Amino acid sequence: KVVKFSYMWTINNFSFCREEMGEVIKSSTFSSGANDKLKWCLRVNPKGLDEESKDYLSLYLLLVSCPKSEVRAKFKFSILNAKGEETKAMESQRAYRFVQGKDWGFKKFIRRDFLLDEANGLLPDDKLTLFCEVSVV
């Protein structure tokens, strides 16, 4: 069976976080619970790290622990708006393969200008809230 879980990550003062937190930002470590060998984190590059992704926020799921062996997981990321609604969701279509220190995700998860345009309601009080759902086989 599948073990489905989630993590909600709030990055405060998002508009300054490249200065205050750096080029790459790792979340706190999380898992499904206390009955779980697996430890994961999210990694964000508030500006993508090559010519092509420079206008995008990049978002990855990183396996931090040293598990039994290879882990195969599906993942879904989305952005929670001002109203508490999930938007801009994208999915791994299949299960990717993680070993300790391996990440998978989207180098171009979302355009910064989309995110920064206040009409879109994605940075209420300059807080970016990301929702990650993970599904381990």
Binding site: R43, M90, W104, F106, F109, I110
Partner: peptide, 10 residues
């Protein structure tokens, strides 16, 4: 593209 669904590793 407002989002790009290509999955890569870091």
């Amino acid at each position: 593209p407002e989002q790009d669904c290509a999955v890569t590793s870091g």
